[PDB]
Amino acid sequence: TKGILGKKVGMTQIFTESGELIPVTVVEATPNVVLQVKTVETDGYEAIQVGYQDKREVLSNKPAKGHVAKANTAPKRFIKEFKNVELGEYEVGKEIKVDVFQAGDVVDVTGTTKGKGFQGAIKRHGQSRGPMSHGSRYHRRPGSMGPVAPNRVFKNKRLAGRMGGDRVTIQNLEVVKVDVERNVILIKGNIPGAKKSLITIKSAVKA
Amino acid sequence: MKVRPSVKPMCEHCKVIRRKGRVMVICPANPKHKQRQG
Amino acid sequence: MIQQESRLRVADNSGAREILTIKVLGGSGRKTANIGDVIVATVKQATPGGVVKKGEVVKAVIVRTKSGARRADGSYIKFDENAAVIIRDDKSPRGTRIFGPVARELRENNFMKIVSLAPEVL
Amino acid sequence: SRIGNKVVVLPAGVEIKQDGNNITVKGPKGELTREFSSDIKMNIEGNEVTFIRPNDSKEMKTIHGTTRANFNNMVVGVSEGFQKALELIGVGYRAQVQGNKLTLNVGYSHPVEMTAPEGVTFEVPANTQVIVKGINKEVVGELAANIRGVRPPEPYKGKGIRYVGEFVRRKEGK
RNA sequence: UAAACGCUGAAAGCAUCUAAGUGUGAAGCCCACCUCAAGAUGAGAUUUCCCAUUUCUUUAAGAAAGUAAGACCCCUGAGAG
RNA sequence: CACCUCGAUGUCGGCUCGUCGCAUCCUGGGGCUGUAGUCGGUCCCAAGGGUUGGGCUGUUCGCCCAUUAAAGCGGCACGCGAGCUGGGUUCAGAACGUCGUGAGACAGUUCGGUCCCUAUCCGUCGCGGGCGUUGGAAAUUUGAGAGGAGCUGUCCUUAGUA
RNA sequence: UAUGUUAAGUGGAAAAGGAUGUGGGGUUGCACAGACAACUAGGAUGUUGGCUUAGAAGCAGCCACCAUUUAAAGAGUGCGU
Numbered sequence A: 001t002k003g004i005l006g007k008k009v010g011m012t013q014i015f016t017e018s019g020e021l022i023p024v025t026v027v028e029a030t031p032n033v034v035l036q037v038k039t040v041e042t043d044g045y046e047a048i049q050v051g052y053q054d055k056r057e058v059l060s061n062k063p064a065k066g067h068v069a070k071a072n073t074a075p076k077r078f079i080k081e082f083k084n085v086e087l088g089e090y091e092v093g094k095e096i097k098v099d100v101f102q103a104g105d106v107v108d109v110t111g112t113t114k115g116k117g118f119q120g121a122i123k124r125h126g127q128s129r130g131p132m133s134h135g136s137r138y139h140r141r142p143g144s145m146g147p148v149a150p151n152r153v154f155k156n157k158r159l160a161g162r163m164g165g166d167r168v169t170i171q172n173l174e175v176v177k178v179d180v181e182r183n184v185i186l187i188k189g190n191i192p193g194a195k196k197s198l199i200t201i202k203s204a205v206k207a
Numbered sequence B: 001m002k003v004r005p006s007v008k009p010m011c012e013h014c015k016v017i018r019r020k021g022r023v024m025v026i027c028p029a030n031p032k033h034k035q036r037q038g
Numbered sequence C: 001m002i003q004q005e006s007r008l009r010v011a012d013n014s015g016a017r018e019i020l021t022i023k024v025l026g027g028s029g030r031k032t033a034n035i036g037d038v039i040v041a042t043v044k045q046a047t048p049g050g051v052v053k054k055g056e057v058v059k060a061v062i063v064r065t066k067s068g069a070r071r072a073d074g075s076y077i078k079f080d081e082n083a084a085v086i087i088r089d090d091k092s093p094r095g096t097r098i099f100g101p102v103a104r105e106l107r108e109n110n111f112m113k114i115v116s117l118a119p120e121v122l
Numbered sequence D: 001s002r003i004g005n006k007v008v009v010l011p012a013g014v015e016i017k018q019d020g021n022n023i024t025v026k027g028p029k030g031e032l033t034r035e036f037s038s039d040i041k042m043n044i045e046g047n048e049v050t051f052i053r054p055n056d057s058k059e060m061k062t063i064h065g066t067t068r069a070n071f072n073n074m075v076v077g078v079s080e081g082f083q084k085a086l087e088l089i090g091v092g093y094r095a096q097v098q099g100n101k102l103t104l105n106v107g108y109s110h111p112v113e114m115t116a117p118e119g120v121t122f123e124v125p126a127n128t129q130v131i132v133k134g135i136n137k138e139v140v141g142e143l144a145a146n147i148r149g150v151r152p153p154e155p156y157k158g159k160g161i162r163y164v165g166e167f168v169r170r171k172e173g174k
Numbered sequence E: 001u002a003a004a005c006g007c008u009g010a011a012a013g014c015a016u017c018u019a020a021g022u023g024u025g026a027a028g029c030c031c032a033c034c035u036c037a038a039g040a041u042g043a044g045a046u047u048u049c050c051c052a053u054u055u056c057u058u059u060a061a062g063a064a065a066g067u068a069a070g071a072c073c074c075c076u077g078a079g080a081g
Numbered sequence F: 001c002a003c004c005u006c007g008a009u010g011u012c013g014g015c016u017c018g019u020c021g022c023a024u025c026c027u028g029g030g031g032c033u034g035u036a037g038u039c040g041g042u043c044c045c046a047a048g049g050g051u052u053g054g055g056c057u058g059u060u061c062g063c064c065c066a067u068u069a070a071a072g073c074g075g076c077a078c079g080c081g082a083g084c085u086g087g088g089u090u091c092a093g094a095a096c097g098u099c100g101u102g103a104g105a106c107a108g109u110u111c112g113g114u115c116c117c118u119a120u121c122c123g124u125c126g127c128g129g130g131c132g133u134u135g136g137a138a139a140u141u142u143g144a145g146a147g148g149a150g151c152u153g154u155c156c157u158u159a160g161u162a
Numbered sequence G: 001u002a003u004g005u006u007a008a009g010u011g012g013a014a015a016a017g018g019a020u021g022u023g024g025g026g027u028u029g030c031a032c033a034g035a036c037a038a039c040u041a042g043g044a045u046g047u048u049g050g051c052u053u054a055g056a057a058g059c060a061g062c063c064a065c066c067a068u069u070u071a072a073a074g075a076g077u078g079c080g081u
């Protein structure tokens, strides 16, 4: 497998070797850097730790500089691990350019969703509003909590709370174009996240 | 298969066998004589 | 976005003048239709000396809609009225001459006779 | 009557190797091994072998007969082998062998591929006459049954794969 | 694995899917897909950083009293609320 | 039967939310057929998911229309009124028929008619503080274990072949 | 401790009924001039007994059931024509 991680920019609207539009999301992938390589004999599993976005040193800290110093790079902001990849191909200090991907390949995209805040059950779970006339006093509410006999409410009864902030994949997307000069990927379709938010791109698990 | 607690043979060619702890009747000639308990 | 109890004009000479959607076909809980989607309907207003007459239950095809259609290239068609064409079990029409324009989306759904009989196909 | 006390002829060229368990058999066709239990007594002569049970219980009579039968199977397979002859019949049915990989045309939209292990052969003397051939009676029967289960017989017209020589009843469908 | 299909096979010289042995076999079960998850008090693992000071009491896993790494207060704010 | 409830017991139906069982409506597997093929009938396994919208009636049911792959049966105080409605329930008014000598009543019907509560505890959904994890801290993580999702039609081809 | 039984978690839920489950006891039949089960050879004739029916001619409906070599064959067990 493979992958990178990058920053969401925004949406566009693109023509692909024909007049057929493709809506597109822009991911800026300033070249990721390997920092650590984990193996079974020391760490329990094969994996590779990666950093994306350079901090200022005043924002970083000593024990992070010490972790970056092996690869001989600058303090990174977002740090993540990639699993189920070849370790003989990758080394500490290696820079992962966007050239790794080929326009057209199928891809999976993780991101943290836009915070919607403390929301009701209707918006949070698609529940239906009660009637708004005919004497109804039941408009935006989640309904009964359950039967009588348990004398208790069953779990996963869906209610109001924080909507958003969750980690979400989108599978079976497609890479539309690459710009290594600009370090940009164009991905067919919407993806989870606010702008200036982290995204992880990976080769598809299903494909 | 004829699943019935009153398993008992229907012709002379029926054999009775306890198979996986269940009683069964097996006739090669007539498979309608095939029976089981349940 | 054509629903049950939604009224439609008629775009052929079959005999009908106004139509009311009984149900949409396709699936179990389809609550909506657009161009290329077949309809089951009544006839609320018919031409007087018409074959198709008041009260008859009949199938139909949506040919143009305000909530219109979309193309791969972002080109979208829309209309100022919701109209339909009455058909038989086969995709062929009851009448003989379609009025007004028609969307291109029907050629994929194999209403080719209606596409031909229509004067303008957008 | 009894089976297990019946002696077991080699007859010659066949050889064996006792052990605490996992008895081995050898000869012209090849090798075989199997783990008979340590409850049976294995008496041996130069040409003849016998099994003796410790007592006259249900379980030991059973094991006695079963071990004699399996040992006889191993010997007979190493000497003469085994073969199951199949006969596939139909309008447009045929078969062909490519090494250890049998191909079957039996009416399904796609041709079907079966494959044997090293200890089993597919012969195909004719397009409709398959033969499995081998040395382990279990594996031979298993493969022949798996093959027969691709398109088994039918009563109305007979279309399907068979064992050569079996009986396949037929109904007078309208 | 279910039901079903068995292969070999004996009790019961045959027969038999089973008793031992062995195998096909379902939208179902455990995985595989996604998410939460070390408060998993059974509290895990790896990398990196700070270092082993002062006094008093004591052989005390002692007490306070300034600090390193670091964090917080406070302030400007939203991609958050 | 009258054991609990008359110093409260709220009565049907619908709505919102669902959850469970399997005696399985569909999908999935298989045997038998009086199964030629398509359709099927029946039985065994299977509860993973799904199991429609309207007219009439207060209605459950039921009939009808039109679809559906299918339009399951039941339980959870005939689930759920400190979550909603209050159409139906003879509260008080009035009237028809009928009964009564009558005041009034229904062996029937009809029009109209106040649904109170700031959530303490558990429970549920979410968010924190404290402490702990045996020196203090910054990050990344395995993953026990839990949950979620689990559906399905139509067309084409194989082939107008078997 | 001693002897046995059970193989279902019976024990630790429930019937009519069904079953080469298993242990005990008894009765009875056949059996080393060879039991039972299997394998081999035969399994027929005057005769395709007749009636029957277009056709039953061993086995649709209908009577009898002699004879043969015998080492044994029913004037025919079913399928099926």
Ligand SMILES: [K+]
Pocket (backbone or CB within 6 Å): A150, A151
């Ligand atoms: K309780």
Ligand SMILES: [K+]
Pocket (backbone or CB within 6 Å): F005, F006, F008, F009
């Ligand atoms: K009461």
Ligand SMILES: [K+]
Pocket (backbone or CB within 6 Å): none
């Ligand atoms: K309640």
Ligand SMILES: [Mg+2]
Pocket (backbone or CB within 6 Å): A136, A137
């Ligand atoms: Mg209001």
Ligand SMILES: [Mg+2]
Pocket (backbone or CB within 6 Å): none
């Ligand atoms: Mg398997």
Ligand SMILES: [Mg+2]
Pocket (backbone or CB within 6 Å): none
């Ligand atoms: Mg009280």
Ligand SMILES: [Mg+2]
Pocket (backbone or CB within 6 Å): none
């Ligand atoms: Mg069931």
Ligand SMILES: [Mg+2]
Pocket (backbone or CB within 6 Å): none
């Ligand atoms: Mg309604």
Ligand SMILES: [Mg+2]
Pocket (backbone or CB within 6 Å): none
């Ligand atoms: Mg109306």
Ligand SMILES: [Mg+2]
Pocket (backbone or CB within 6 Å): none
């Ligand atoms: Mg209730």
Ligand SMILES: [Mg+2]
Pocket (backbone or CB within 6 Å): none
């Ligand atoms: Mg009322």
Ligand SMILES: [Mg+2]
Pocket (backbone or CB within 6 Å): none
């Ligand atoms: Mg009154």
Ligand SMILES: [Mg+2]
Pocket (backbone or CB within 6 Å): none
């Ligand atoms: Mg009077």
Ligand SMILES: [Mg+2]
Pocket (backbone or CB within 6 Å): none
């Ligand atoms: Mg009023």
Ligand SMILES: [Mg+2]
Pocket (backbone or CB within 6 Å): none
């Ligand atoms: Mg409240």
Ligand SMILES: [Zn+2]
Pocket (backbone or CB within 6 Å): B010, B011, B012, B013, B014, B015, B026, B027, B028, B029, B030, B033
């Ligand atoms: Zn039988």
